[PDB]
Amino acid sequence: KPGSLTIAGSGIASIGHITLETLALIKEADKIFYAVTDPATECYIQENSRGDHFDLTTFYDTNKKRYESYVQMSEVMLRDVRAGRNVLGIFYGHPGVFVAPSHRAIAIAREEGFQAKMLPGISAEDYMFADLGFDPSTYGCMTQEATELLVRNKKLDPSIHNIIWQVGSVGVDTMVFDNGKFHLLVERLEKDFGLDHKIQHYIGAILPQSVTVKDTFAIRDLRKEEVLKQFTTTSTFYVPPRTPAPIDPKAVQALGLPATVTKGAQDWTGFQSVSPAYGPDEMRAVAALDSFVPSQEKAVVHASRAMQSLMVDLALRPALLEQYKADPVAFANTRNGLTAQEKFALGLKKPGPIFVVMRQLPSAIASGQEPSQEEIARADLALVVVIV
Amino acid sequence: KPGSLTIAGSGIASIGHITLETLALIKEADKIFYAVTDPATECYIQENSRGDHFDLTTFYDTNKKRYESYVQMSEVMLRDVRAGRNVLGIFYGHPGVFVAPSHRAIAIAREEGFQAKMLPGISAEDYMFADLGFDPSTYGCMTQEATELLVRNKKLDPSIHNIIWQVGSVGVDTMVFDNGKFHLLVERLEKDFGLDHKIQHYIGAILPQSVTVKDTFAIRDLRKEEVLKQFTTTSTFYVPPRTPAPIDPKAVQALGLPATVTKGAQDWTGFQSVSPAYGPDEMRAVAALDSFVPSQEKAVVHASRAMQSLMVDLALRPALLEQYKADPVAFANTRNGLTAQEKFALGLKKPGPIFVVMRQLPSAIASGQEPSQEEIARADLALVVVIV
Ligand SMILES: Nc1ncnc2c1ncn2[C@@H]1O[C@H](CSCC[C@H](N)C(=O)O)[C@@H](O)[C@H]1O
Numbered sequence: 001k002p003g004s005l006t007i008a009g010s011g012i013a014s015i016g017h018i019t020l021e022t023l024a025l026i027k028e029a030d031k032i033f034y035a036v037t038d039p040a041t042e043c044y045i046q047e048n049s050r051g052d053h054f055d056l057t058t059f060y061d062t063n064k065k066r067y068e069s070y071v072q073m074s075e076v077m078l079r080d081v082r083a084g085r086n087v088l089g090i091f092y093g094h095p096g097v098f099v100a101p102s103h104r105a106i107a108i109a110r111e112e113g114f115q116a117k118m119l120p121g122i123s124a125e126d127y128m129f130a131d132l133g134f135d136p137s138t139y140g141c142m143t144q145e146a147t148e149l150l151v152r153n154k155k156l157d158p159s160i161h162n163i164i165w166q167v168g169s170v171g172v173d174t175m176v177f178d179n180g181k182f183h184l185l186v187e188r189l190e191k192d193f194g195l196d197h198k199i200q201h202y203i204g205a206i207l208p209q210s211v212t213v214k215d216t217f218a219i220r221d222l223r224k225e226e227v228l229k230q231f232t233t234t235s236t237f238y239v240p241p242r243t244p245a246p247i248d249p250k251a252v253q254a255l256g257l258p259a260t261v262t263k264g265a266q267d268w269t270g271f272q273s274v275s276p277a278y279g280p281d282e283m284r285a286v287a288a289l290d291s292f293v294p295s296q297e298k299a300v301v302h303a304s305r306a307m308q309s310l311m312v313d314l315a316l317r318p319a320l321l322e323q324y325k326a327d328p329v330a331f332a333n334t335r336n337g338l339t340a341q342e343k344f345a346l347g348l349k350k351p352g353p354i355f356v357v358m359r360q361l362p363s364a365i366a367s368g369q370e371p372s373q374e375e376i377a378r379a380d381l382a383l384v385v386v387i388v
Numbered sequence: 389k390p391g392s393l394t395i396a397g398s399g400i401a402s403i404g405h406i407t408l409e410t411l412a413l414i415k416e417a418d419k420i421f422y423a424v425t426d427p428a429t430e431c432y433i434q435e436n437s438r439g440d441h442f443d444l445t446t447f448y449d450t451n452k453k454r455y456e457s458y459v460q461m462s463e464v465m466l467r468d469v470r471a472g473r474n475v476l477g478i479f480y481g482h483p484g485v486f487v488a489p490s491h492r493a494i495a496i497a498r499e500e501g502f503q504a505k506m507l508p509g510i511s512a513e514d515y516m517f518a519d520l521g522f523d524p525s526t527y528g529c530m531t532q533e534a535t536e537l538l539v540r541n542k543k544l545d546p547s548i549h550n551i552i553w554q555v556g557s558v559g560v561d562t563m564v565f566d567n568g569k570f571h572l573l574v575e576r577l578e579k580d581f582g583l584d585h586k587i588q589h590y591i592g593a594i595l596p597q598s599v600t601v602k603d604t605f606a607i608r609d610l611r612k613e614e615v616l617k618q619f620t621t622t623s624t625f626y627v628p629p630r631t632p633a634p635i636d637p638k639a640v641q642a643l644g645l646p647a648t649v650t651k652g653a654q655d656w657t658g659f660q661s662v663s664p665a666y667g668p669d670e671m672r673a674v675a676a677l678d679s680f681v682p683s684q685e686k687a688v689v690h691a692s693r694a695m696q697s698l699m700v701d702l703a704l705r706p707a708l709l710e711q712y713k714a715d716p717v718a719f720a721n722t723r724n725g726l727t728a729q730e731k732f733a734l735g736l737k738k739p740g741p742i743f744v745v746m747r748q749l750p751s752a753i754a755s756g757q758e759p760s761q762e763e764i765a766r767a768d769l770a771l772v773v774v775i776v
């Protein structure tokens with residue numbers, strides 16, 4: 001059935017945050033509908049495109065319900081899908097994070113029997129973790145829209161990370177943003193954290209000329225006229241925990257961990273107790289570094305030019321991927337530079353075989369010993385945090 | 389000071405999730421340290437690089453404490469920074485989401501007086517929103533590590549979206565993952581949601597050959613051996629809201645939102661109440677679409693080639709960006725194809741002026757009328773969800 005919908009993101013920073021798969025799609029799509037934040041990104045999308053594009057932000061108006069705009073945004077995309085075009089929608093950031101028309105359009109398209117897919121993009125929260133230098137895993141991390149939090153009369157949990165989005169549009173359902181209802185959010189913060197607790201006002205840099213906003217304010221300061229001025233439709237708040245929960249010695253014991261575990265994963269922001277970088281355990285790990293030899297030989301990458309070229313192709317060329325998926329043995333036959341082993345692996349169209357052929361022990365490489373057909377066919381994640 | 393540290397991500401999907409700014413850095417960096425999850429991504433990094441690289445995953449071992457490995461990963465990067473090198477670190481996904489050695493290395497580099505920066509990447513949660521088709525904003529969304537949730541004796545809130553990471557490594561501090569403590573997570577889920585509530589087991593597709601895992605299980609099912617065994621170190625759980633909180637009519641009033649609005653921003657997954665795609669409100673919006681005319685004239689993109697060329701350069705070339713920030717007036721003067729207005733705006737090194745010169749009203753464009761020096765000098769976001 002002709003016609004498809006792909007919805008992707010542009011990320012937050014101008015141009016730089018765009019993913020490789022997304023740039024590829026921009027170049028090939030029949031038509032692009034976009035809602036982005038800065039003119040350099042907008043121009044970049046247009047100029048890389050096939051030249052058939054539409055600015056979704058043209059459906060906004062000062063006193064018009066945003067919900068009405070969103071329905072219309074979804075609809076113009078669906079019309080072109082119905083017309084049998086390959087439609088790309090692009091929203092700034094991640095197209096599925098605090099975005100109504102994307103999920104709406106995908107669901108309707110699928111219901112009408114078209115293929116539809118969302119691609120992830122770089123969100124404002126992703127930008128925040130990088131710029132503010134915290135990890136959501138350290139205490140756990142709650143994401144909420146400011147108006148959503150208030151309309152459902154939710155409380156904020158002061159023991160975890162909190163991120164509050166759209167703080168500049170509390171209670172606003174049109175396009176007039178005057179901060180008239182901001183005080184309601186301040187009242188919530190006061191109740192949950194008190195007046196002395198500090199929050200972080202975050203605006204990630206959109207242009208090269210932008211500088212990151214990461215100002216700290218005590219909750220009591222959020223009433224000052226000069227502070228209030230700074231909160232825009234772009235503003236996000238980070239609220240660090242006031243009262244991180246203590247380790248439960250009973251749970252530690254039940255998990256089979258050492259009782260001498262006094263610590264969780266380190267937070268480096270300076271909002272909590274800042275433990276020295278090179279304590280005894282760190283000193284010991286550093287001292288052991290040069291000497292460390294793994295218990296078993298580790299594999300290294302070992303792939304033909306043909307294998308690597310194909311694997312890049314499948315990542316970046318959706319037309320080639322569709323053909324490979326339809327008929328992998330036929331597809332792999334196309335690429336005669338492939339070793340026997342690689343051709344066999346690709347035919348199976350399974351992930352495990354790929355790892356066996358593209359990664360080999362140095363010992364086996366030196367010997368010239370290749371993986372057996374059996375080793376290939378039978379086959380099948382680095383954890384980079386420990387809360388303990 | 390000679391020596392810098394930049395830490396970036398590779399995203400989750402092989403190659404396609406890498407950001408444009410990250411590829412640029414791979415090409416230019418003196419030295420790359422990486423921890424990635426697939427050999428195509430690994431090869432791609434190597435082949436785009438200047439050929440000085442190091443596999444951080446060399447520091448793991450079966451019965452070695454992961455924390456020791458992480459200290460060592462940070463340290464090898466810091467050694468090269470201290471040596472005066474421009475170092476790039478790359479971790480799969482987002483390098484600051486559930487990653488200990490990145491935030492550590494950045495903090496230490498900064499404290500020692502070196503320039504250090506984290507760039508965002510596509511996280512597993514980013515992948516999940518796109519794949520599972522939900523928006524964290526609709527009910528709020530809590531992110532947590534499985535072991536952390538247990539060791540701090542946290543309760544899960546059944547009124548919001550919940551995402552639980554590292555479910556396949558409960559209580560494990562080394563590199564042996566047997567799921568021997570996974571039952572502890574099941575007990576927690578049982579207490580908070582009961583036995584009949586359904587969760588989704590998510591594994592985003594890493595290779596072209598991978599297929600997305602998005603299986604639904606009742607909490608009851610999680611104790612079965614053939615189910616339990618499916619949960620690997622790559623697994624994440626999505627736990628949809630069981631009892632979403634009602635829209636409080638009094639909060640609706642206080643917020644200045646339309647009365648008796650009962651309908652919060654729509655979730656399309658199927659886990660929440662079925663709701664017509666084309667109810668009367670949506671139909672009215674669709675009918676109004678074709679004749680919609682905005683109340684005032686909207687600006688459009690309007691910039692010289694020189695402006696667009698420079699703005700792309702600044703997004704993708706850190707060397708040029710540094711020179712620009714050092715002397716913006718002198719830098720702008722070197723691009724003689726800029727309009728006089730563009731040269732002035734750029735020389736201010738402020739974001740507001742850029743918007744003034746790069747977006748102009750069609751009426752003014754037709755006149756050749758440009759923004760004034762005064763308009764540019766005094767210069768100072770599309771919201772894409774509304775929770776009702
Ligand atoms: N540059 C920026 N810095 C900080 N927060 C930002 C931001 N741009 C957008 N946001 C956040 O996103 C809200 C708009 S909703 C759209 C978010 C976008 N889809 C994303 O993935 O990030 C803003 O009100 C704010 O809370």
Ligand SMILES: Nc1ncnc2c1ncn2[C@@H]1O[C@H](CSCC[C@H](N)C(=O)O)[C@@H](O)[C@H]1O
Pocket residue numbers: 382383384385400479480481482483484485486487510511512513552553554555556590591592593594621622623624625
């Ligand atoms: N392909 C994948 N699908 C789903 N979850 C994944 C995943 N890869 C990693 N994860 C999640 O991430 C955990 C590893 S911690 C590292 C996460 C990475 N920095 C990121 O930004 O996503 C896993 O235990 C799992 O919960």
